[PDB]
Amino acid sequence: RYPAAVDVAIVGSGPTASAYARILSEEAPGATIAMFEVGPTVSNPPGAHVKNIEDPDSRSLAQRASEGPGAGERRARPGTYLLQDGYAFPGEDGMPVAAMSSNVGGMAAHWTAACPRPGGKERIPFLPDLEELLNDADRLLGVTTHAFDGAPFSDLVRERLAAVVDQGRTPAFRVQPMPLAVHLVWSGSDVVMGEATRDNPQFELFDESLVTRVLVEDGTAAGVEVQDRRSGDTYQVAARYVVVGADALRTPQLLWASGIRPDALGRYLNDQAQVVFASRLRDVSEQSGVAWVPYTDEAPFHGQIMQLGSIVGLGLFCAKDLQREDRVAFDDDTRDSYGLPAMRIHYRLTERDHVVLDRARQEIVRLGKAVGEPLDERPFVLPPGASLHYQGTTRMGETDDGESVCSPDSQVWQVPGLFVAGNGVIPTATACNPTLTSVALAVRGARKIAEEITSSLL
Ligand SMILES: Cc1cc2nc3c(=O)[nH]c(=O)nc-3n(C[C@H](O)[C@H](O)[C@H](O)COP(=O)(O)OP(=O)(O)OC[C@H]3O[C@@H](n4cnc5c(N)ncnc54)[C@H](O)[C@@H]3O)c2cc1C
Ligand SMILES: OC[C@H]1O[C@H](O)[C@H](O)[C@@H](O)[C@@H]1O
């Protein structure tokens, strides 16, 4: 079913992995590419967003097909599934609501498209071209800030918030329309790989293909072992490069099972603590758009105010005090529904995490009162894992120091040719939506590969 060898093997079909296919497809048009996705194809084109399926019955089945092994408070959103066990532990908080997606497009086939920029200490210092890669991350995702201009309440919502937020802040950190990847139509991975990949003769996308191991020969990326999930037979596909973009949890799971077990892999896992709140405007689906209250080092929260349109939703996301004991561990002795080392989350909020969390509750209420009439009296704190923004599992670093898993170009240290993509590549304590940053990092690695493929003599 699969070829024998390719120039580049891509594990996963999320937005970051499809960015590698994108830049490679349009920058290295000659190389051969094999993208292997465990989950099925649930949209058209592959990776399209489910919200774009008109029929609400075709959309539900498209969602349950993405819930992987969970195809049968603590529950997951449609298109996602939770862990069987090992999420919470005694003496720790854990991520009871940490979810995943198994389908062509990844979670990019279910997200809400928010794509803000990092500010202050969110931005990655050792990247002097971050602003350039960020704009390319805009291009690939089809980001737009003017998706809700005619919207009647988007302007009023932004006005009331600015009166309570804009004091003393520079223009980049004032209230503004959230940059959205809205392609009335949502952007998935279908928009990232796009036509360049979809019309690339040397690119092939294999759903129902489980990558159970990254092959390495001579200490260098040698390929991948792919298990055809429709025949149960295990193949082996060679390649000069291997891109692993299977999300911040399963990516370290694949490397750990592959023998690539650096002491840093899976550690410094950080989740954005989410705080929900609602308010009712005072007056008389394009109706309100999305409002962005940027992050700042002095208020390490990220603010989303969306049209759910008199009633608006308020969510605040917290950057975390990164620690080593925040780690995704793996047990060889116990497999999971896919047959890989069962994972286990060691996650605990430090006192600094709570000092910020309760600050988010005080501030989201201030924002709720600024916009109008608060519904509930008290803001509700979502359990760890709800944000679905897991960073640091394969964090990036400027040099090798036992706490970075890859290089600034996403190239895993002890395994040349193996690149990692996704939220886990982020190393800094962030509060905004990472996907735009994850695509920016993925674009930097992809065009590092295209640089080497087209400049080599092989
Ligand atoms: C409801 C919802 C709303 C969201 N809203 C936002 C938002 O507004 N802004 C934002 O920034 N983010 C948002 N997110 C999160 C966003 O989707 C992720 O940040 C992003 O999709 C990460 O992309 P990725 O490619 O790194 O990983 P993913 O998109 O998760 O891709 C991982 C893929 O790899 C596959 N895979 C895993 N292991 C293997 C294997 N061994 N072999 C083969 N394939 C494998 C999986 O099946 C999956 O398809 C939202 C998520 C949800 C669920
Ligand atoms: O509950 C819906 C929410 O789900 C997730 O937490 C997303 O981060 C947010 O964008 C979305 O509105």
TrEMBL record:
Leader sequence residues: none
MF annotations from Gene Ontology: flavin adenine dinucleotide binding; oxidoreductase activity, acting on CH-OH group of donors
Binding residue positions for FAD: T16, E37, N103, M107, T112, A114, V211, N423, N433, T435
Pfam families cross-referenced by the UniProt entry: GMC_oxred_C (PF05199), GMC_oxred_N (PF00732)
Domain Glucose-methanol-choline oxidoreductase C-terminal, first and last residues per copy: 332-442
Residue numbers spanned by region Disordered: 44-76
Record keywords, A-Z: FAD, Flavoprotein, Nucleotide-binding, Oxidoreductase
Cofactor(s) listed: FAD
InterPro entries named in the record: FAD/NAD-bd_sf, GMC_OxRdtase_N, GMC_OxRtase_C, P2Ox-like
Domain Glucose-methanol-choline oxidoreductase N-terminal positions: 203-272
Similarity section: Belongs to the GMC oxidoreductase family.
The name this protein goes by in its record: GMC oxidoreductase family protein
Naturally occurring in which organism (per UniProt): Pseudarthrobacter siccitolerans
